[PDB]
Amino acid sequence: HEIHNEFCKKKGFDPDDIQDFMADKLNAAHDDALPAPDMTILKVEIFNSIQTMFVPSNVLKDHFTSLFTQFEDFWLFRKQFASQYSSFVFMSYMMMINNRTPHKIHVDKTSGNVFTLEMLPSRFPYERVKPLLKNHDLS
Amino acid sequence: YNRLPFPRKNPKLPENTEKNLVKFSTTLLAPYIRPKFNADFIDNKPDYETYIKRLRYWRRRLENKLDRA
């Protein structure tokens, strides 16, 4: 989240403009003479409009290449970031922990070590929501 | 605001959020925070648009104040 905010404020934006943009483009299609009752196609096209107009998909890589004064350091950082992010994805996948927003994921800029705070699993009250059956595979 | 409260013509605040913030205003700091915090929910500033704009303005001013410490 800090890296994203530095990128947004380095240009002429602030990242609540993304929420304003998705709110305006999502509210501009609920009106009469319906051009898009399907929410999914409109959500995909405003996702692409966010990825093109506001935040391209090279922000994190460019920030970390500008961070280290040598490419050996960036290469070793990425080599460790991939393994530590694999461990983080396993800890998020097993035990079913919640939404990993980009302010809950912390990165060490001297090692590449990734950790996270708010490691709270998600327990749903329903036994009704499941792709598997209710009776035979588990009682 | 993103929970789809309405299809968002010109929305208004729920009563529980207003009672929560008037509770938090008494649980704030007494002498100087309260006469300025109270001037931003008495005059119908909660209408889900100026409320969020006020909160963003106050958050930016507070982050500049804490960064000049």
Curated annotation (Swiss-Prot), chain A:
Protein localization: Nucleus
Start and end residues of each stretch annotated as Catalytic loop: 96-104
Free-text note regarding domains: The C-terminal domain (2233-2836) is essential for its ability to interact with activators. The FATC domain and precise positioning of the C-terminal carboxyl group are required for stability and function of the protein.
Role description: Essential scaffold subunit of the transcription coactivator SAGA complex. SAGA acts as a general cofactor required for essentially all RNA polymerase II transcription. At the promoters, SAGA is required for transcription pre-initiation complex (PIC) recruitment. It influences RNA polymerase II transcriptional activity through different activities such as TBP interaction (via core/TAF module) and promoter selectivity, interaction with transcription activators (via Tra1/SPT module), and chromatin modification through histone acetylation (via HAT module) and deubiquitination (via DUB module).
Family: Belongs to the PI3/PI4-kinase family. TRA1 subfamily.
Subunit structure: Component of the 1.8 MDa SAGA (Spt-Ada-Gcn5 acetyltransferase) complex, which is composed of 19 subunits TRA1, SPT7, TAF5, NGG1/ADA3, SGF73, SPT20/ADA5, SPT8, TAF12, TAF6, HFI1/ADA1, UBP8, GCN5, ADA2, SPT3, SGF29, TAF10, TAF9, SGF11 and SUS1.
Further information: Although strongly related to the PI3/PI4-kinase family, it lacks the typical motifs that constitute the catalytic site of PI3/PI4-kinase proteins, suggesting that it may lack such activity.
Protein name stated in the entry: SAGA complex/NuA4 acetyltransferase complex subunit TRA1
UniProt source species: Saccharomyces cerevisiae (strain ATCC 204508 / S288c)
Gene: TRA1
